[PDB]
Structures are given as C-alpha cells and as structure tokens.
Amino acid sequence: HMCDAFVGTWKLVSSENFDDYMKEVGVGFATRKVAGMAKPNMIISVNGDVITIKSESTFKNTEISFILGQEFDEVTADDRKVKSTITLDGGVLVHVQKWDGKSTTIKRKREDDKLVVECVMKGVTSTRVYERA
Ligand SMILES: O=C(O)[C@H]1C[C@@H]1c1cc2ccccc2n1Cc1cccc(Cl)c1
C-alpha cells in the first residue's frame, strides 16, 4: 500500500503554465479561461485494487476509477473522450491519455506535504500543486 501516500482530500494552491498546456491539448478560449480559474478539490481513495480520483470544482466535476495497468475510458474536464492507462513507476502515478491520434501524460507525485501534478503535451509542461484540504 505505497499508494497510501496519495489518499486523502487535496485542494489546488498553485498552477504554472497551465494555459499553455491546455492550448497544446486543444482546449478552446472560453474553456481555458473558466477552467483556469478553478481551484478544484481532489479526493483520492483506494479500495482493494481500485483507485478512485475525484475532482470537484466550480467548473466541472470529474471522476475516474481504475486498476493500475488496465486501460479505461475517461471523460476529461474539457470533454475529451480518451483512453487512459495509469501505472505506478517508482512511486509516481503515470497517467497516459490517448485520443484522436494524440497523447498527453499526467504525473502525480508526493513531495513534502504536497501533491504535485505535472501535465505534459509535446514540449509543454505545467505544474499544479495541491495541499491537504
Ligand atoms: O488534476 C489536475 O490538476 C489536472 C489534471 C487535470 C486537468 C487536465 C485538464 C485538461 C484540460 C482542462 C483542464 C484540465 N485539468 C484541470 C482541471 C481544471 C478545472 C476543473 C477540473 Cl475538474 C480539472
């Protein structure tokens, strides 16, 4: 139960370069503005082999439940319909999303008391930092 360190309730405190990430992904103007304002709460839980990541915000709510290494269907906050696979590599959750011939990778890691979310599309990276709620 190493995934233990992720479990909890988390609140966004900072975001860097996320507009550029969203642009690279294909998000349109109005969604970038509204999504970029949001300060979501993320709730991570584990029950047996199933991990659940729920995000609640003023903009959209999202929820994914998955088993590591097992592809699943996901609806993203920006309404992409993707095929997702999440693995644990050296204590980092690595989440690859595939859609329309494109790919993006989201890494989630624990650093000090924070949960750091790094979103990468092509050469663009963004960092989102969460603290315990
Ligand atoms: O967990 C994170 O920090 C980022 C992985 C999540 C992510 C990807 C993505 C792509 C496009 C637009 C927004 C997007 N959001 C953030 C986000 C913003 C507003 C409300 C909600 Cl529920 C989620």
Swiss-Prot record:
Phosphotyrosine modifications at: 21
Taxonomic superkingdom: Eukaryota
Gene3D superfamilies, per database record: 2.40.128.20
GO biological process entries: brown fat cell differentiation; cellular response to lithium ion; cellular response to tumor necrosis factor; cholesterol homeostasis; fatty acid transport; long-chain fatty acid transport; negative regulation of DNA-templated transcription; positive regulation of cold-induced thermogenesis
Record GO terms (molecular function): fatty acid binding; hormone receptor binding; long-chain fatty acid binding; long-chain fatty acid transmembrane transporter activity
Modification N-acetylcysteine, positions: 3
PROSITE patterns per the UniProt record, alphabetical: FABP (PS00214)
Motif (Nuclear localization signal): 23-33
Residue numbers binding a fatty acid: 128-130
Keywords: Acetylation, Cytoplasm, Lipid-binding, Nucleus, Phosphoprotein, Transport
The keyword Cytoplasm belongs to this UniProt entry's keyword annotation: yes
Disulfide bridge map: none
Cell compartment(s), UniProt: Cytoplasm; Nucleus
Effect of residue 24 to D: In a breast cancer sample; somatic mutation
GO cellular component, one term: extracellular exosome
Modified residue annotations for Phosphoserine: 14
One Pfam family recorded for the sequence: Lipocalin
Matches recorded under InterPro entries: Calycin, Fatty_acid-bd, ILBP, Lipocln_cytosolic_FA-bd_dom
The family this protein is said to belong to: Belongs to the calycin superfamily. Fatty-acid binding protein (FABP) family.
Entry comment, domain topic: Forms a beta-barrel structure that accommodates hydrophobic ligands in its interior.
Assembly with partners or alone: Monomer. Homodimer. Interacts with PPARG.
Function statement: Lipid transport protein in adipocytes. Binds both long chain fatty acids and retinoic acid. Delivers long-chain fatty acids and retinoic acid to their cognate receptors in the nucleus.
The name this protein goes by in its record: Fatty acid-binding protein, adipocyte
Lineage: Eukaryota, Metazoa, Chordata, Craniata, Vertebrata
Gene: FABP4
